[PDB]
Ligand binder design. Structure first.
Ligand SMILES: Cc1cc2c(cc1C)N(C[C@H](O)[C@H](O)[C@H](O)COP(=O)(O)OP(=O)(O)OC[C@H]1O[C@@H](n3cnc4c(N)ncnc43)[C@H](O)[C@@H]1O)c1[nH]c(=O)[nH]c(=O)c1N2
Ligand SMILES: O=C1O[C@H](CO)[C@@H](O)[C@H](O)[C@H]1O
Length: 566
């Protein structure tokens, strides 16, 4: 058989959810196309303490950006999983969600049916939380039962290794003294605070719970669910007509290099990730006709914001050294703008407010005018209001024991304003795309990252944590003296950042009139039966780690797809 009801392109975090849910109807056939293969036995993947091992290996796509001209000019890797399970197989396993009001903004933008209350049941539907044991509670693990699922495919919990220790106790106390409270659960729509966050972990087996272990392997003997692993989707092909486009199927390349077709009777769902789904649309003739014709593609749908509105965060690290060994829980802190900036908040806010229209005008040029000034101003206003009025967190700060006397912190500004893009460089599906996130394009983006770095320096010096810490080692005071200007902080951050690997927005869910690529049922404009369901569709960044929200989005999409089939 090479004809199926649905073809899901990309057996990753989001694609496996859609394939799982659509195959619950035994009369519906579902084909998954995945470029990689199983990592059920890959020790870099299964190890619950293995984050980083897979970097640069054969299961890391290692996509490369262009030289980042606003960030001191180097290329950056954008990592992504090439595996059944996608990027959930190589990620840091943290499970945190979003601010309620920031999901509500999706409807404010024009996406009917996308609010926190609409998404919440789908976060619960995805999740099977293992409650913390008494020793884990003593370590600071907590949850709110009303906002965690107990029955879903994705196991979430805390390491059996979790123990209370000097470092996490001191951090808890130090943040409390700085006015940032310990919160029991960051996944109930209000994320501000200090928390011992849960992970995507099977606590029983002590193994990473990736999307394939959650949504594929326990279901793999469904006779209506088919997998073509080691298989790359090149492009969609269409029914005749030159009318709203009807996808007939997907053109594929097998491991032996042979090009063939598989056919879809109902819909093609594209879940190849934010750095591939827009490329697959372009190769199919759906995108900016000038780019398509330059690259020898016949345009089928004039939708020039395919690949535009790319938004990513950037990550920096700091470190300190204890007088002696440091231990305890890994902690996350989600500070607001006023937590980070204290007395300077009002002037930071006023500078930011004064730059929004300038940011918008600069971003218009990034898409050569396929986003309008007024639309970018409205988008940037919504983001500004979340930061300033709703006080959503502006940073994620991770602290954990780094081994021996080391304390490591990793941090990122959550809501930079820079937008960039991704586009094909050829019609050859193997050619590397031109990927440009435009890191540090706007003043707020580097100024907030510097505020965050300074805040971490201050926390390490604050009581009672300061009684445990002998010195800051990264950057340290030789590199960045106590009185260093913001410019010196920004320069160091630019020299040392990486992508945070949270790209969104390249097939953004917005009304077509304001630049969207998909409607509120994730259907690509100009097509009858093509959807994108993965990070590409998020119209803005979120505060937490992506998988929780991608699973919830894919769960919700699955219900929308089923409703449309009835
Ligand atoms: C290093 C690192 C660390 C983190 C994270 C990312 C990374 C890279 N993230 C982010 C999160 O893991 C990520 O955003 C999602 O897994 C992305 O899910 P998607 O479904 O969008 O794409 P995803 O990349 O999962 O899936 C796309 C699938 O499509 C396949 N594919 C691509 N092109 C194809 C083609 N042409 N044909 C066939 N198949 C194709 C890919 O191989 C892949 O399996 C994270 N999140 C989190 O919640 N907690 C965390 O701690 C972290 N930490
Ligand atoms: O959990 C994590 O996710 C972050 C991205 O979500 C990544 O940058 C950190 O290195 C990692 O610890």
């Amino acid at each position: 058989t090479t004809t199926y009801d649905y073809i899901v392109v990309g057996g990753g975090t989001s694609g496996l959810v859609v394939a799982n849910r659509l195959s619950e109807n035994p009369d519906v056939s579902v084909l998954l196309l995945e470029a990689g293969a199983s990592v059920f036995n890959n020790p870099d993947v299964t190890n619950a303490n293995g984050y980083g091992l897979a970097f640069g290996s054969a299961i890391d796509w290692q996509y490369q950006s262009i030289n980042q001209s606003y960030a001191g000019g180097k290329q950056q890797v954008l990592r992504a999983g090439k595996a059944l399970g996608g990027t959930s197989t190589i990620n840091g396993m943290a499970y945190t969600r979003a601010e309620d009001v920031q999901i509500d903004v999706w409807q404010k933008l024009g996406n009917e049916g996308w609010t926190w209350k609409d998404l919440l049941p789908y976060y619960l539907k995805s999740e099977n939380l293992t409650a913390p044991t008494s020793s884990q509670v003593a370590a600071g693990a907590a949850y709110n039962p009303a906002v965690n699922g107990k029955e879903g495919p994705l196991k979430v919990g805390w390491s059996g290794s979790l123990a209370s220790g000097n470092l996490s106790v001191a951090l808890n106390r130090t943040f409390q003294a700085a006015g940032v409270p310990w919160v029991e659960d960051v996944n109930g729509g209000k994320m501000r605070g200090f928390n011992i966050y849960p992970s995507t972990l099977d606590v029983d087996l002590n193994v990473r719970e990736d999307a394939a272990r959650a949504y594929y392997f326990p279901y793999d003997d469904r006779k209506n669910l088919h997998l073509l692993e080691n298989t790359t989707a090149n492009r969609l092909f269409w029914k005749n007509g030159s009318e709203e486009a009807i996808a007939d199927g997907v053109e594929i390349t097998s491991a032996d290099g042979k090009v063939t077709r598989v056919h879809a009777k109902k819909e093609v769902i594209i879940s190849a990730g934010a750095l591939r789904s827009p490329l697959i649309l372009e190769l199919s003739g759906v995108g900016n006709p000038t780019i398509l014709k330059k690259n020898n593609i016949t345009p089928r749908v004039d939708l020039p914001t395919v690949g535009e509105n790319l938004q990513d965060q950037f990550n920096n690290g700091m470190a300190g050294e204890g007088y002696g060994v440091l231990a305890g829980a890994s902690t996350v802190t989600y500070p607001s703008i006023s937590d980070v900036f204290g007395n300077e908040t009002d002037s930071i806010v006023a500078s930011l407010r004064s730059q929004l229209s300038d940011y918008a005008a600069a971003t218009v040029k990034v898409s050569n005018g396929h986003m309008k000034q007024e639309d970018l101003e409205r988008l940037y206003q919504l983001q500004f209001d979340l930061i300033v009025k709703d006080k959503v967190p502006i940073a994620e700060i991770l602290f954990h024991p780094g081994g021996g006397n080391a304390v490591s912190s990793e941090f990122w500004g959550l809501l930079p304003f820079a937008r960039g893009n991704i586009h094909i460089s050829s019609n050859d599906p193997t050619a590397p795309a031109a990927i440009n996130p435009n890191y540090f394009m706007f003043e707020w983006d580097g100024k907030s990252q510097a505020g965050i770095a300074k805040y971490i320096r201050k926390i390490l010096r604050s009581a009672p944590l300061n009684k445990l810490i002998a010195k800051e080692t990264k950057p340290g005071l030789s590199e960045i003296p106590a009185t260093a200007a913001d410019e010196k902080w920004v320069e160091w951050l630019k020299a040392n950042y990486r992508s945070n690997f949270h790209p969104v927005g390249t097939a953004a869910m917005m009304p077509r009139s304001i630049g969207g690529v998909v409607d509120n049922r994730l259907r690509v404009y100009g097509t009858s039966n093509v959807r994108v369901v993965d990070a590409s569709v998020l119209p803005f960044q979120v505060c937490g780690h992506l998988v929780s929200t991608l699973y919830a989005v894919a769960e919700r999409a699955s219900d929308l797809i089923k409703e449309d089939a009835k």
